[PDB]
Write an enzyme that holds these catalytic residues in place. Structure first.
Site, mmCIF file in Angstrom:
data_model
loop_
_atom_site.group_PDB
_atom_site.id
_atom_site.type_symbol
_atom_site.label_atom_id
_atom_site.label_comp_id
_atom_site.label_asym_id
_atom_site.label_seq_id
_atom_site.Cartn_x
_atom_site.Cartn_y
_atom_site.Cartn_z
ATOM 1 N N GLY A 123 -8.417 -12.536 -0.330
ATOM 2 C CA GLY A 123 -8.901 -13.860 -0.675
ATOM 3 C C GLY A 123 -7.819 -14.859 -1.009
ATOM 4 O O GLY A 123 -8.106 -16.055 -1.131
ATOM 5 N N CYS A 167 0.856 -1.186 0.000
ATOM 6 C CA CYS A 167 0.000 0.000 0.000
ATOM 7 C C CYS A 167 0.891 1.236 0.000
ATOM 8 O O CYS A 167 1.597 1.484 0.980
ATOM 9 C CB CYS A 167 -0.937 -0.001 1.206
ATOM 10 S SG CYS A 167 -2.127 -1.367 1.288
ATOM 11 N N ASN A 191 -6.095 3.748 -2.567
ATOM 12 C CA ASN A 191 -5.155 2.854 -3.219
ATOM 13 C C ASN A 191 -5.859 1.992 -4.259
ATOM 14 O O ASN A 191 -7.059 2.122 -4.512
ATOM 15 C CB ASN A 191 -4.450 1.976 -2.186
ATOM 16 C CG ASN A 191 -5.398 1.429 -1.142
ATOM 17 O OD1 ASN A 191 -6.537 1.874 -1.027
ATOM 18 N ND2 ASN A 191 -4.932 0.451 -0.376
ATOM 19 N N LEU A 192 -5.076 1.111 -4.889
ATOM 20 C CA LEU A 192 -5.644 0.080 -5.748
ATOM 21 C C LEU A 192 -6.520 -0.867 -4.951
ATOM 22 O O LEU A 192 -7.585 -1.283 -5.422
ATOM 23 C CB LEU A 192 -4.526 -0.696 -6.443
ATOM 24 C CG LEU A 192 -4.939 -1.936 -7.236
ATOM 25 C CD1 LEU A 192 -5.855 -1.550 -8.386
ATOM 26 C CD2 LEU A 192 -3.724 -2.697 -7.737
ATOM 27 N N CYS A 193 -6.116 -1.174 -3.719
ATOM 28 C CA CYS A 193 -6.955 -1.951 -2.824
ATOM 29 C C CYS A 193 -8.164 -1.168 -2.327
ATOM 30 O O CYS A 193 -9.056 -1.778 -1.732
ATOM 31 C CB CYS A 193 -6.135 -2.446 -1.631
ATOM 32 S SG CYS A 193 -4.814 -3.601 -2.062
ATOM 33 N N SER A 194 -8.214 0.153 -2.578
ATOM 34 C CA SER A 194 -9.385 1.027 -2.382
ATOM 35 C C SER A 194 -9.868 1.011 -0.939
ATOM 36 O O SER A 194 -11.070 1.017 -0.665
ATOM 37 C CB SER A 194 -10.540 0.681 -3.330
ATOM 38 O OG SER A 194 -10.979 -0.655 -3.193
ATOM 39 N N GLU A 195 -8.947 0.986 -0.022
ATOM 40 C CA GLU A 195 -9.336 0.815 1.367
ATOM 41 C C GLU A 195 -8.742 1.866 2.279
ATOM 42 O O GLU A 195 -9.379 2.257 3.258
ATOM 43 C CB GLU A 195 -8.909 -0.573 1.838
ATOM 44 C CG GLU A 195 -7.505 -0.930 1.398
ATOM 45 C CD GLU A 195 -6.918 -2.071 2.183
ATOM 46 O OE1 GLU A 195 -7.556 -2.502 3.165
ATOM 47 O OE2 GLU A 195 -5.816 -2.536 1.820
ATOM 48 N N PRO A 247 -9.626 -6.989 0.066
ATOM 49 C CA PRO A 247 -10.008 -8.313 -0.441
ATOM 50 C C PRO A 247 -8.870 -9.312 -0.318
ATOM 51 O O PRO A 247 -8.142 -9.566 -1.285
ATOM 52 C CB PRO A 247 -10.372 -8.039 -1.905
ATOM 53 C CG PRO A 247 -9.668 -6.779 -2.245
ATOM 54 C CD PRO A 247 -9.650 -5.967 -0.993
#
Ligand SMILES: Nc1ncnc2c1ncn2[C@H]1C[C@H](O)[C@@H](COP(=O)(O)OP(=O)(O)OP(=O)(O)O)O1
Ligand SMILES: Nc1ncnc2c1ncn2[C@H]1C[C@H](O)[C@@H](COP(=O)(O)OP(=O)(O)OP(=O)(O)O)O1
Ligand SMILES: Nc1ncnc2c1ncn2[C@H]1C[C@H](O)[C@@H](COP(=O)(O)OP(=O)(O)OP(=O)(O)O)O1
Ligand SMILES: Nc1ncnc2c1ncn2[C@H]1C[C@H](O)[C@@H](COP(=O)(O)OP(=O)(O)OP(=O)(O)O)O1
Lengths: 673, 673
Positions: free
Chosen positions: B568, B163, B366-370, B566
């Site tokens: 996973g 991140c 971020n790309l992880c959008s968190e 996410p």
């Protein structure tokens, strides 16, 4: 396609460093090969318990004697073995054990047993109930002081003997029975050999019509064809036969259609009558043993030729055949210079030392050419009819290290443990096809013990192989192990309270084998020889007298205890040299595959360079003198391999034969070139 | 070429046994695969000592923190791990760990680490000196109650954060510096994303000559070409730009030569001014931020659009551009129905809850959008000249299990150990290329904590995912972990005696985040929800009051503590379901290679069959209500992936957007089909 690192390290050994070899390149050729190959291809386990459960469930061992110990005792003997942390010095040490002698997986693509594991399992099998005796077996084995025989060390409690000696009677049902028994034992890998001195000659009357026997050579052809059905065998013949020339036609240098042997080794057993007749250069007489059986009632090898030769001569009933025995000596030396065939046994010289001559006379030996016992031919009638159960020969193997016993000096306890293990092997082994060898192993309780690393150990000490010092060393050492072996056998027959059968007619019950040893003390007459034997008590003749009194007190357990076999297949994993035969090369060179390993002799340097001599450049006369010096203590025969060359002649081989007959040498082996 | 046994066992799972599946065929597909593959391909060792010596000499680990314990303590934590004897229930459990997450050999043809080994090494790294805390880390990990992030669990002491959030200033030297920094971090695998709200528009005067700017799309083309040199990145833009339509031209459904993005994800951050202007269906005005900087002195995203919109309107200096924002809403919904692009952030709704609004306003993620933190753009002059060090964002990851925490009930000690480990990760991590993110991680001491297995655990208990019971469950549970996390951060800032920087302007120093929690008790209003929470004390508002007094007593250590990603990729080895997003299928089916594994959901049977619903057949409104219920306790954003279908329409997506803006939802993710 690249040659791996340890093979290149083994190639680096032969690099000339100031006129020498890079010996320590072996060690990295060990050490990298352990790292890069051995530790990367072993099946992982989390503990010992799941490992043993995998061994049980994957059907790898007899679980019964393994369940004769607790898991804690198994872990104790395993910890005792792994506490050694045995460091292999040789490339061929790991390169034969984990390649061949180790039990691998079912697809054989990983490792299951370690070097401690197989030894510890074999120790638990030999002890069979006791933990501490198994640890003693480990200390005898993990220090390489003893090495058991190949199937014994191989398949101890897995899924056994390589010595079998039988006879043949003169009936077709006997022939079929012997063919069946050889086919039974051929699938089990045992060494089975026979002797054919009780068969009718070629062109004789088969009981009703004249000139009907096809001859023994058809039976030899049949057995040679019969051995093509399994993975080998041998047969002998007494020399005073008309087809004995045809016995030389078997290993003919022109391989015929009609005579094509590929498996059956032959060996001519020569009594003193034949060397008597060839020595005087007079014409000799072979006979027809079926006419002998029809006339006197017995076969020709039933009686001595020296007595009954003229009794066969004057009797017109047995048909004669007159030859020159010196020409037979010439052709025998010719075939021995061609290959080294056949074997030569001085059976009268065997009976000159044979303790169980009250039973019979030894007339044959094995393919290993070492075991000499008494025997009785059986007789098999038809299937509905009843048969006979004669006597047979089966002698187990297993060698020890001269070097490790002479360095660790536990020689009597070594005799104890080796005798108990060989007793356990003779107890457990059973045959369910021919009951005659079953009865013979049940009756004789005969064992065979040998040793290795004579030339390498003594030459490593700085003693020449062609020294009388080494001969006196073998004399005193084998006197001591003879003392300990007879002591152990007498102790064992005391502890059992029971001896072998027909012990009373042997020389042990009359003390005649000790009559040589109640006098003639074999104390070392040389200073370095004695100093090697210093540190332990050397038994004198009075120890032999107390041994004789103890043997006459109870008895001895084994009718035979000792034999010497060419057990060279285990010297690499024993990290040692060969048996008492001297070495041929200082550096063995092999092409394993896509490679050239260069395994030197263990302990090879420049100081013992000329102590590690070459077998092509030795006096054979000193060797057979050493052989007689050792044979002064051995009950059975010793497989002395002749180390000859191509440039030698047949008459010198004849002089060697006369010298060996003068020395009372029992047998000889195939010769070298 | 034959398919092995365990793969056939996995194929046997889908066999219809009375309308069901052969679930237990997984276990043999586990158990044989352990036997036939795992235990046959591991590097053998004789003990632990030589294993660790091999790990040291073969250059596999940082040996320093490994030498911060004795060999006995290492064996103690190893025995503690192996005392579990962890039985993998899933095929994908071993099938991803020993395939990917385990450290293998250099040629990668055997196994080195076991499942206990990596966990124990990670525990020793997290503890870094203490043995018992490492054993507690094991008990948190070997019972799968916590799972660290992917590089953290991967390369703990081997050869780290995903991140990274930076900004860009309006100079060419800044552009080159940012290109260099992205190329520096791209080789390290970290997730690096940015925002471009401080760049001049297309066709503007570059400082001397009119109409000279090529535009931002060339810089986007340059960054897209620059990311082709490593193994990915992203960039945003504030919506009130003239090239914002060109920002939609980036992820064009007609992939052009002139615009070809392959790596850069885009996301439009929408303040309340734009939904205000599109809601009234009135024509809106984007501006030129360079003219804004030349006129007012600051960029456009420096100031709020709701205040300064009319102040930009009446001022003739900043050049206008008038559009229909409802048509932009239509095209945004069209691109989201095409793919799911771009992302949408309600930054005013983010600042409506943002505790560190005294620093700045969050304008990107971020790309992880968190992750949503405060930031400051830097400025880089020439090489000989001096530059500036702004503020950046780096938030570490690492999730826990709702199921295992709710079953083992060590929730506060779980918070303790997870916070200490994340503190250790934030301490050890260092950057030596861009010192701004180094300073930011040194100053903020910000962490991120998340969880997984919401739908699988609660649906395994017999609770529907679309129940308000599950919403109250998430409410109470995340209230409790919010209590424990704030308690741990306040305890840690007490024990250090020191807090994060600019703590005083945050709501924690004024107690305003607890003002929601000093009232409004989130005790469970449902009986099964409370009964799941029975067995432990539920903190009421008075516990929040004492927590508020303790926070005002010392301070809090982390400016942010929580984020939801996410994660996973670790659910299989955690033997668990995904994060709080509900499942899509009851049985995942994969073609690994030359095969078809059928991995069902963990705990899939007929009772929770309709509890394990399908994501295409759910009400999204209850999902975003659950999202708001969770967001009642989370400081940062949550990567809510939209679970949509192909048959839906854009106007319903608009209603979803209005519903989420009504709910104060921070961000959304890419949508499903
Ligand atoms: N000659 C050998 N005999 C047996 N094992 C060997 C031999 N040479 C190498 N190895 C084995 C032992 C180890 O598993 C590996 C090499 O490590 P090695 O250094 O020889 O043993 P070690 O672990 O007792 O000593 P060290 O602690 O110095 O590493 O392969
Ligand atoms: N047809 C045959 N062809 C070749 N050999 C035969 C034939 N028949 C028998 N024999 C062989 C095998 C026997 O070992 C040997 C003796 O013959 P056989 O009749 O089987 O022995 P026997 O027990 O009945 O008494 P005898 O020794 O007097 O012949 O000759
Ligand atoms: N699910 C699993 N998780 C971990 N290891 C497994 C699993 N399934 C099989 N194995 C491993 C453990 C063993 O090394 C081997 C199979 O033996 P296994 O019976 O499962 O364990 P175990 O040794 O504890 O029990 P048992 O004594 O009954 O054999 O492969
Ligand atoms: N020749 C060029 N072609 C395209 N872009 C350029 C060129 N020269 C400069 N720029 C771009 C990159 C800069 O981010 C932006 C501003 O130009 P630059 O002169 O580098 O900034 P500056 O710090 O000197 O002040 P200013 O913002 O007033 O231009 O335009």
């Amino acid at each position: 396609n690249q040659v791996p690192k340890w093979i290149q390290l083994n190639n680096e050994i032969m690099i000339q460093k100031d006129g020498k070899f890079q010996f320590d390149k072996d060690k990295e050729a060990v050490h990298s090969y352990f790292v890069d190959y051995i530790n990367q291809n072993t099946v992982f386990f989390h503990n010992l318990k799941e490992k043993l459960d995998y061994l049980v469930e994957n059907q790898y061992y007899e679980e019964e004697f393994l369940s004769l110990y607790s898991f804690e005792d198994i872990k104790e003997v395993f910890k005792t073995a792994y506490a050694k942390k045995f460091r292999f010095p040789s490339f061929m040490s790991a390169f034969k054990f984990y390649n061949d002698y180790a039990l691998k997986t079912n697809d054989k693509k990983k490792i299951l047993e370690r070097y401690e594991d197989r030894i510890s399992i074999v120790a638990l099998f030999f002890a069979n109930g006791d933990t501490e005796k198994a640890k003693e077996y480990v200390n005898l084995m993990i220090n390489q002081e003893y090495q058991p025989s190949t199937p014994t060390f191989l398949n101890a409690g897995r899924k056994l003997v390589s010595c079998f000696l039988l006879e043949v009677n003169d009936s077709l049902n006997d022939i079929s029975r012997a063919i069946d028994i050889s086919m039974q034992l051929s699938k089990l890998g045992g060494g089975v050999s026979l002797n054919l001195s009780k068969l009718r000659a070629k062109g004789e009357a088969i009981k009703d019509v004249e000139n009907a026997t096809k001859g023994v050579v058809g039976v030899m052809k049949l057995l040679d064809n019969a051995f093509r059905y399994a993975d080998s065998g041998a047969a002998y013949l007494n020399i005073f036969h008309r087809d004995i020339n045809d016995f030389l036609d078997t290993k003919k240098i022109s391989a015929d259609e009609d005579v094509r042997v590929k498996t059956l080794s032959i060996g001519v057993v020569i009594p003193d009558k034949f060397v008597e007749l060839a020595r005087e250069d007079k014409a000799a007489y072979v006979f027809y043993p079926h006419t002998i059986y029809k006339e006197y009632g017995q076969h020709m090898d039933e009686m001595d030729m020296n007595e009954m030769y003229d009794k066969f001569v004057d009797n017109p009933r047995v048909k004669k055949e007159k030859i020159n025995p010196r020409k037979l000596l010439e052709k025998l030396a010719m075939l021995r210079s061609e290959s080294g065939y056949p074997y030569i046994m001085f059976q009268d010289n065997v009976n000159k030392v044979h303790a169980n001559n009250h039973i019979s006379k030894v007339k044959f030996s094995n393919l290993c050419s070492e075991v000499l016992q008494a025997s009785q031919v059986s007789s098999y009638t038809d299937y509905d009819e009843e048969d006979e159960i004669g006597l047979d020969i089966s002698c187990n193997l297993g060698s020890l290290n001269i070097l490790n016993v002479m360095e660790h000096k536990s020689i009597e306890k070594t005799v104890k443990l080796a005798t108990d293990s060989l007793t356990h092997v003779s107890e457990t082994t059973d045959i369910r096809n021919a009951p005659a060898v079953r009865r013979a192993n049940k009756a004789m309780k005969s064992i065979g013990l040998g040793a290795m690393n004579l030339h390498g150990y003594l030459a490593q000490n700085g003693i020449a192989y062609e020294s009388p010092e080494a001969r006196d060393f073998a004399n005193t050492f084998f006197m001591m192990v003879n003392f300990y072996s007879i002591q152990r056998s007498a102790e064992i027959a005391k502890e059992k309270g029971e001896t072998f059968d027909q012990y009373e007619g042997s020389t042990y019950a009359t003390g005649e084998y000790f009559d040589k040893y109640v006098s003639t003390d074999f104390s070392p007459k040389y200073e370095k020889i004695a100093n090697l034997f210093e540190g332990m008590h050397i038994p004198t003749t009075e120890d032999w007298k107390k041994l004789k009194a103890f043997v006459a007190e109870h008895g001895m357990y084994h009718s035979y205890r000792l034999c010497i076999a060419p057990t060279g297949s285990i010297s690499y994993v024993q990290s040692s040299t060969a048996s008492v035969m001297p070495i041929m090369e200082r550096i063995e060179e092999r092409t394993y595959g896509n490679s050239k390993t260069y395994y030197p002799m263990p302990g090879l340097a420049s100081n013992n360079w000329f102590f590690y001599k070459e077998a092509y450049d030795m006096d054979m006369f000193k060797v057979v003198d050493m052989i007689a010096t050792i044979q002064q203590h051995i009950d059975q025969g010793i497989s002395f391999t002749l180390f000859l060359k191509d440039t030698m002649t047949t008459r010198d081989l004849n002089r060697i034969d006369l010298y060996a007959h003068h020395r009372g040498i029992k047998t000889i082996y195939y010769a070298r070139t």
